[PDB]
RNA sequence: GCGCGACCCCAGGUCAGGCGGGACUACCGCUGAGUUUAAGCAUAUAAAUAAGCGGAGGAGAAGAAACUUACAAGGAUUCCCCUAGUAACGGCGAGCGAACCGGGAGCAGCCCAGCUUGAGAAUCGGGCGGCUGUGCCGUCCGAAUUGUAGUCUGGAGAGGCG
RNA sequence: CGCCCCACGAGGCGCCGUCAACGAGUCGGGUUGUUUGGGAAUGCAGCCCAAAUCGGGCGGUAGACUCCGUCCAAGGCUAAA
RNA sequence: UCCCGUGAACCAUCGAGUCUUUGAACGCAAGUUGCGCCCGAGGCCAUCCGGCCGAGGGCACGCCUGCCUGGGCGUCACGC
């Protein structure tokens, strides 16, 4: 909706930031296991359910 | 000493004088809420012998409860099961009404602790009990050694947990020999004990 | 604390003596030891038992006398030695007996 | 600036240093968005220095007010001792030591005497 | 609250009060009650401010004199238990019962006890007015055990 | 009585007179000017706004409102705002457009802070 | 045209204070099934259990005989072994099933109400003040005589003599 | 280890014989329901009846009489295993 | 300068502090950053020596002890 409540706007703000590739310098960091962001979300595939 | 006089006069509960005063008190009680603060015991002797004192922090609250048995709350009297659990109308609650009154006053009165409760008046539909409550944050109770034992944390909601006079009566703790050996420490404790399969190491 | 020689119940074990719970009031009185003081100095008291036999009473009275014979009691204070106390010279060798000190 | 010297200041000087540090924090966030390289780390230092100077403000203030109300007056809730709710609702040792008159007599008389055997 | 307390007196009028309770509402007359209360006012107990001085001025007699010079004061006795003990030991010369004690069972048995231990008893009107005699809020019973030699006839 | 209805009489109550304040410390102003104006946004869009509309574009605290935004832009920068508009960006931060009175020049203010 | 006292009940953002919710191993109270077994099934069994609803603590509960026994009797509570798969209970079918005695672990017994200062509430709380500060003390109010403190608890006790 | 010294109050012990006070819609009984190993009814609970003071509860088969063994409920606190 | 010292550290540890919106959640509600009421440090001008803008902070429910203001011929004594 274009008329979204502030709660939903605030909580859709965070799921914006939650969707970015890992910083490249995470991969070179010692004793690391992070291979990619295994929690990405695409808007056509996974609906946030709210 | 007057308490012997008044106690015997309350022993004679079918006399004309007690019938009069008890009917008029029953009407007055029936015209008030179920749980009502009352300033002083109507039965000073009975209150005293159970540990009431004319001291700050001991309050008296009159509690009303309905009479009759506990009729099973199922949606139309339909109890899905074998015929031997299928009754409704002649089941009896396994806590006495004295305890029910204590467990009403205890819930509504959070900040106070239930000491005892005693019968005051009765009619066809309602029993009236007077519950003695104790205020354990009150300094005059903190400084009385005979009642400090009630300020320790292990005596929370005695009424809700089955520890008062009515509590022990309906728990069947009034008795020690046979006829009462299963109820020590509790019926569930003895059931657990008798059901534990003891497998010793060198069995 | 000290425990009395008593008989068991029950035809199966009537003849077999065992340690009881405490000395009766009659026994404490006749051995000359006050009611409220007996539990103080290591002597149990069982106000619920009844003495039905001289055979039992003198049997336990000999135990009370033996215990008082080989009992030592420290003073409640350091220098003040009141009645019922014991002298320092034999207080100084006192030990902790271990196990059953009066077998039945 | 260091804390050993930062406690040893006056109230006005300490808040004035707070103000200057906060303005510096403002200008470092100014240059965060435009420039970079070498001043981008001073923001960490200025932030921690804000933390130091506010901690000094608050610690010194609450110490002073502990002194002021610690004439054993009524103490406020933010100053009373929080340990746990059970601890606050226990009885003080005098309250626990309350024992009845008959028992006080029974402990004056008839104490637990000290004994051994084989005497 | 008002409604039930008015219906209270209405119901106590309607119902048949038994003789034991109906002995109340038959109180000592106005003139006789006032005349008796004159004397009960003469023989009031000791105040608190008036009780501090009696113990504070014996200081010289206890610290220095080492003697007790005080005598027996004569006051009215009160309290249900104390007065019942006195009446059963027959050291009561007169008993004053408040008509309006709630619960009434505290004073129902008094008249028979008084009568059959042969003690003069009256049921005056006003437990608060009795309480004033002894400075408590409610008294519910009083008694005279002794009077000064200058007031025997009028007692 | 005249009316046959009984109403609760007008009693007298006291205002609170605590014997000890339930809070001792004075609460510090956590929405001070520096938390309420985090930093001027310097994207090309706000850059063009600076000259075309004489407005400075800030990122401001999410609990700020137009009243505090003007009051704060007055204490900092020694300026005043003729008007202020606020929106909440999708990223979460609130963005505020502060339009100056024409006595004050946005280029001069933005050069005295350093944006261009 | 009243001023009084008591009772009972109001409203107070009055002063000072205690309540509510969370965790589930263990613990206390209520409520409370059936699948299953009986080669069917309906009492019984599953089970005085699972689920439901509440309440606490470091343990909880019980506890100082209105006990068991029939003995030469013992002697609070709790737990282990034995009693005992026994007495008993059961469409006497399936099954179910404790206790006393005894041996051990540990053992501690206590306090109220009532007749009992009546030359005299000796008791307790609160405000304020002091100090030595988990309290003590002074003063002023209040609670309380419809009984606070003290003595007493059946093993006793109260009195009187030593 | 040191200073502080324990009473006319309380207790214990011995005797006396006078008092000797002890918990009520509670026990207890009928009937119903549940539960138990508890069987003419093991506890509990509802309703009705409802006390006793030379008495009351037990002694595992209901009943009345005689005797005997035993305990004192209807208030409260209490570690240890 | 953080290096033979008021002293580094994604160090350890814990007593001095901070602890956003909520939630038993407590001003009223809540698909609402919704709608209130009271105190008030501080400043303005003086329509007075009052009012405006406030930093902050309160305002829930039953309950106890006490205190205040009250109600009812419920019981009364004294009075016009
Ligand atoms: Mg907008
Ligand atoms: Mg089958
Ligand atoms: Mg089959
Ligand atoms: Mg089938
Ligand atoms: Mg369950
Ligand atoms: Mg316990
Ligand atoms: Mg065998
Ligand atoms: Mg079974
Ligand atoms: Mg059931
Ligand atoms: Mg039955
Ligand atoms: Mg207990």
mmCIF file with all atom_site columns, N, CA and C (backbone and C1' of nucleotides) in Angstrom, chain I residues 17-30:
data_model
loop_
_atom_site.group_PDB
_atom_site.id
_atom_site.type_symbol
_atom_site.label_atom_id
_atom_site.label_alt_id
_atom_site.label_comp_id
_atom_site.label_asym_id
_atom_site.label_entity_id
_atom_site.label_seq_id
_atom_site.pdbx_PDB_ins_code
_atom_site.Cartn_x
_atom_site.Cartn_y
_atom_site.Cartn_z
_atom_site.occupancy
_atom_site.B_iso_or_equiv
_atom_site.pdbx_formal_charge
_atom_site.auth_seq_id
_atom_site.auth_comp_id
_atom_site.auth_asym_id
_atom_site.auth_atom_id
_atom_site.pdbx_PDB_model_num
ATOM 1  P P     . G I 1 17 ? 26.612 4.281  40.892 1.00 0.00 ? 17 G I P     1
ATOM 2  O "O5'" . G I 1 17 ? 26.720 5.130  39.556 1.00 0.00 ? 17 G I "O5'" 1
ATOM 3  C "C5'" . G I 1 17 ? 25.895 4.830  38.446 1.00 0.00 ? 17 G I "C5'" 1
ATOM 4  C "C4'" . G I 1 17 ? 26.386 5.505  37.196 1.00 0.00 ? 17 G I "C4'" 1
ATOM 5  C "C3'" . G I 1 17 ? 25.476 5.388  35.991 1.00 0.00 ? 17 G I "C3'" 1
ATOM 6  O "O3'" . G I 1 17 ? 24.420 6.326  36.013 1.00 0.00 ? 17 G I "O3'" 1
ATOM 7  C "C1'" . G I 1 17 ? 27.664 4.842  35.354 1.00 0.00 ? 17 G I "C1'" 1
ATOM 8  P P     . U I 1 18 ? 22.951 5.877  35.560 1.00 0.00 ? 18 U I P     1
ATOM 9  O "O5'" . U I 1 18 ? 23.081 5.706  33.986 1.00 0.00 ? 18 U I "O5'" 1
ATOM 10 C "C5'" . U I 1 18 ? 23.257 6.840  33.159 1.00 0.00 ? 18 U I "C5'" 1
ATOM 11 C "C4'" . U I 1 18 ? 23.503 6.456  31.729 1.00 0.00 ? 18 U I "C4'" 1
ATOM 12 C "C3'" . U I 1 18 ? 22.371 5.728  31.044 1.00 0.00 ? 18 U I "C3'" 1
ATOM 13 O "O3'" . U I 1 18 ? 21.341 6.593  30.614 1.00 0.00 ? 18 U I "O3'" 1
ATOM 14 C "C1'" . U I 1 18 ? 24.405 4.638  30.577 1.00 0.00 ? 18 U I "C1'" 1
ATOM 15 P P     . C I 1 19 ? 19.830 6.275  31.030 1.00 0.00 ? 19 C I P     1
ATOM 16 O "O5'" . C I 1 19 ? 19.544 4.891  30.316 1.00 0.00 ? 19 C I "O5'" 1
ATOM 17 C "C5'" . C I 1 19 ? 19.679 4.771  28.913 1.00 0.00 ? 19 C I "C5'" 1
ATOM 18 C "C4'" . C I 1 19 ? 19.769 3.328  28.510 1.00 0.00 ? 19 C I "C4'" 1
ATOM 19 C "C3'" . C I 1 19 ? 18.523 2.508  28.770 1.00 0.00 ? 19 C I "C3'" 1
ATOM 20 O "O3'" . C I 1 19 ? 17.551 2.665  27.754 1.00 0.00 ? 19 C I "O3'" 1
ATOM 21 C "C1'" . C I 1 19 ? 20.414 1.347  29.565 1.00 0.00 ? 19 C I "C1'" 1
ATOM 22 P P     . U I 1 20 ? 16.185 3.444  28.064 1.00 0.00 ? 20 U I P     1
ATOM 23 O "O5'" . U I 1 20 ? 15.727 3.998  26.647 1.00 0.00 ? 20 U I "O5'" 1
ATOM 24 C "C5'" . U I 1 20 ? 16.415 5.055  26.001 1.00 0.00 ? 20 U I "C5'" 1
ATOM 25 C "C4'" . U I 1 20 ? 15.925 5.195  24.586 1.00 0.00 ? 20 U I "C4'" 1
ATOM 26 C "C3'" . U I 1 20 ? 14.532 4.637  24.354 1.00 0.00 ? 20 U I "C3'" 1
ATOM 27 O "O3'" . U I 1 20 ? 13.521 5.579  24.648 1.00 0.00 ? 20 U I "O3'" 1
ATOM 28 C "C1'" . U I 1 20 ? 16.009 3.765  22.732 1.00 0.00 ? 20 U I "C1'" 1
ATOM 29 P P     . U I 1 21 ? 12.131 5.096  25.277 1.00 0.00 ? 21 U I P     1
ATOM 30 O "O5'" . U I 1 21 ? 11.448 4.281  24.100 1.00 0.00 ? 21 U I "O5'" 1
ATOM 31 C "C5'" . U I 1 21 ? 10.788 4.941  23.036 1.00 0.00 ? 21 U I "C5'" 1
ATOM 32 C "C4'" . U I 1 21 ? 9.932  3.968  22.276 1.00 0.00 ? 21 U I "C4'" 1
ATOM 33 C "C3'" . U I 1 21 ? 9.010  3.123  23.136 1.00 0.00 ? 21 U I "C3'" 1
ATOM 34 O "O3'" . U I 1 21 ? 7.789  3.776  23.419 1.00 0.00 ? 21 U I "O3'" 1
ATOM 35 C "C1'" . U I 1 21 ? 10.211 1.731  21.657 1.00 0.00 ? 21 U I "C1'" 1
ATOM 36 P P     . U I 1 22 ? 6.842  3.249  24.598 1.00 0.00 ? 22 U I P     1
ATOM 37 O "O5'" . U I 1 22 ? 6.133  1.970  23.980 1.00 0.00 ? 22 U I "O5'" 1
ATOM 38 C "C5'" . U I 1 22 ? 5.774  0.872  24.800 1.00 0.00 ? 22 U I "C5'" 1
ATOM 39 C "C4'" . U I 1 22 ? 6.046  -0.434 24.102 1.00 0.00 ? 22 U I "C4'" 1
ATOM 40 C "C3'" . U I 1 22 ? 5.642  -1.689 24.852 1.00 0.00 ? 22 U I "C3'" 1
ATOM 41 O "O3'" . U I 1 22 ? 4.274  -1.995 24.673 1.00 0.00 ? 22 U I "O3'" 1
ATOM 42 C "C1'" . U I 1 22 ? 7.807  -1.945 23.901 1.00 0.00 ? 22 U I "C1'" 1
ATOM 43 P P     . G I 1 23 ? 3.305  -2.084 25.941 1.00 0.00 ? 23 G I P     1
ATOM 44 O "O5'" . G I 1 23 ? 3.467  -3.584 26.438 1.00 0.00 ? 23 G I "O5'" 1
ATOM 45 C "C5'" . G I 1 23 ? 3.302  -4.676 25.546 1.00 0.00 ? 23 G I "C5'" 1
ATOM 46 C "C4'" . G I 1 23 ? 4.198  -5.826 25.928 1.00 0.00 ? 23 G I "C4'" 1
ATOM 47 C "C3'" . G I 1 23 ? 4.083  -6.299 27.364 1.00 0.00 ? 23 G I "C3'" 1
ATOM 48 O "O3'" . G I 1 23 ? 3.056  -7.256 27.522 1.00 0.00 ? 23 G I "O3'" 1
ATOM 49 C "C1'" . G I 1 23 ? 6.365  -6.010 26.783 1.00 0.00 ? 23 G I "C1'" 1
ATOM 50 P P     . A I 1 24 ? 1.767  -6.945 28.417 1.00 0.00 ? 24 A I P     1
ATOM 51 O "O5'" . A I 1 24 ? 2.271  -7.102 29.919 1.00 0.00 ? 24 A I "O5'" 1
ATOM 52 C "C5'" . A I 1 24 ? 2.793  -8.333 30.391 1.00 0.00 ? 24 A I "C5'" 1
ATOM 53 C "C4'" . A I 1 24 ? 2.378  -8.610 31.813 1.00 0.00 ? 24 A I "C4'" 1
ATOM 54 C "C3'" . A I 1 24 ? 1.502  -7.568 32.472 1.00 0.00 ? 24 A I "C3'" 1
ATOM 55 O "O3'" . A I 1 24 ? 0.145  -7.668 32.086 1.00 0.00 ? 24 A I "O3'" 1
ATOM 56 C "C1'" . A I 1 24 ? 3.179  -8.298 33.981 1.00 0.00 ? 24 A I "C1'" 1
ATOM 57 P P     . A I 1 25 ? -0.902 -6.536 32.525 1.00 0.00 ? 25 A I P     1
ATOM 58 O "O5'" . A I 1 25 ? -0.076 -5.187 32.396 1.00 0.00 ? 25 A I "O5'" 1
ATOM 59 C "C5'" . A I 1 25 ? 0.255  -4.644 31.126 1.00 0.00 ? 25 A I "C5'" 1
ATOM 60 C "C4'" . A I 1 25 ? 0.885  -3.283 31.272 1.00 0.00 ? 25 A I "C4'" 1
ATOM 61 C "C3'" . A I 1 25 ? 1.195  -2.561 29.967 1.00 0.00 ? 25 A I "C3'" 1
ATOM 62 O "O3'" . A I 1 25 ? 0.973  -1.167 30.135 1.00 0.00 ? 25 A I "O3'" 1
ATOM 63 C "C1'" . A I 1 25 ? 3.171  -2.800 31.228 1.00 0.00 ? 25 A I "C1'" 1
ATOM 64 P P     . C I 1 26 ? -0.511 -0.571 30.059 1.00 0.00 ? 26 C I P     1
ATOM 65 O "O5'" . C I 1 26 ? -0.755 -0.031 31.530 1.00 0.00 ? 26 C I "O5'" 1
ATOM 66 C "C5'" . C I 1 26 ? -1.331 1.246  31.739 1.00 0.00 ? 26 C I "C5'" 1
ATOM 67 C "C4'" . C I 1 26 ? -0.666 1.982  32.867 1.00 0.00 ? 26 C I "C4'" 1
ATOM 68 C "C3'" . C I 1 26 ? 0.742  2.481  32.580 1.00 0.00 ? 26 C I "C3'" 1
ATOM 69 O "O3'" . C I 1 26 ? 0.970  3.680  33.311 1.00 0.00 ? 26 C I "O3'" 1
ATOM 70 C "C1'" . C I 1 26 ? 0.797  0.935  34.358 1.00 0.00 ? 26 C I "C1'" 1
ATOM 71 P P     . G I 1 27 ? 1.208  5.063  32.541 1.00 0.00 ? 27 G I P     1
ATOM 72 O "O5'" . G I 1 27 ? -0.259 5.632  32.323 1.00 0.00 ? 27 G I "O5'" 1
ATOM 73 C "C5'" . G I 1 27 ? -1.153 5.757  33.415 1.00 0.00 ? 27 G I "C5'" 1
ATOM 74 C "C4'" . G I 1 27 ? -2.380 6.541  33.037 1.00 0.00 ? 27 G I "C4'" 1
ATOM 75 C "C3'" . G I 1 27 ? -3.278 5.913  31.988 1.00 0.00 ? 27 G I "C3'" 1
ATOM 76 O "O3'" . G I 1 27 ? -4.157 4.949  32.525 1.00 0.00 ? 27 G I "O3'" 1
ATOM 77 C "C1'" . G I 1 27 ? -2.876 8.146  31.407 1.00 0.00 ? 27 G I "C1'" 1
ATOM 78 P P     . C I 1 28 ? -4.684 3.749  31.603 1.00 0.00 ? 28 C I P     1
ATOM 79 O "O5'" . C I 1 28 ? -5.453 4.475  30.420 1.00 0.00 ? 28 C I "O5'" 1
ATOM 80 C "C5'" . C I 1 28 ? -6.765 4.976  30.597 1.00 0.00 ? 28 C I "C5'" 1
ATOM 81 C "C4'" . C I 1 28 ? -7.366 5.380  29.278 1.00 0.00 ? 28 C I "C4'" 1
ATOM 82 C "C3'" . C I 1 28 ? -7.384 4.308  28.208 1.00 0.00 ? 28 C I "C3'" 1
ATOM 83 O "O3'" . C I 1 28 ? -8.423 3.367  28.374 1.00 0.00 ? 28 C I "O3'" 1
ATOM 84 C "C1'" . C I 1 28 ? -6.587 6.305  27.275 1.00 0.00 ? 28 C I "C1'" 1
ATOM 85 P P     . A I 1 29 ? -8.298 1.921  27.694 1.00 0.00 ? 29 A I P     1
ATOM 86 O "O5'" . A I 1 29 ? -8.420 2.227  26.141 1.00 0.00 ? 29 A I "O5'" 1
ATOM 87 C "C5'" . A I 1 29 ? -7.962 1.297  25.175 1.00 0.00 ? 29 A I "C5'" 1
ATOM 88 C "C4'" . A I 1 29 ? -7.628 1.988  23.881 1.00 0.00 ? 29 A I "C4'" 1
ATOM 89 C "C3'" . A I 1 29 ? -6.994 1.120  22.813 1.00 0.00 ? 29 A I "C3'" 1
ATOM 90 O "O3'" . A I 1 29 ? -7.956 0.417  22.052 1.00 0.00 ? 29 A I "O3'" 1
ATOM 91 C "C1'" . A I 1 29 ? -5.743 3.101  23.059 1.00 0.00 ? 29 A I "C1'" 1
ATOM 92 P P     . A I 1 30 ? -7.626 -1.035 21.465 1.00 0.00 ? 30 A I P     1
ATOM 93 O "O5'" . A I 1 30 ? -6.461 -0.774 20.415 1.00 0.00 ? 30 A I "O5'" 1
ATOM 94 C "C5'" . A I 1 30 ? -6.669 0.043  19.276 1.00 0.00 ? 30 A I "C5'" 1
ATOM 95 C "C4'" . A I 1 30 ? -5.355 0.443  18.664 1.00 0.00 ? 30 A I "C4'" 1
ATOM 96 C "C3'" . A I 1 30 ? -4.534 -0.701 18.103 1.00 0.00 ? 30 A I "C3'" 1
ATOM 97 O "O3'" . A I 1 30 ? -4.938 -1.033 16.789 1.00 0.00 ? 30 A I "O3'" 1
ATOM 98 C "C1'" . A I 1 30 ? -3.165 0.677  19.459 1.00 0.00 ? 30 A I "C1'" 1
#
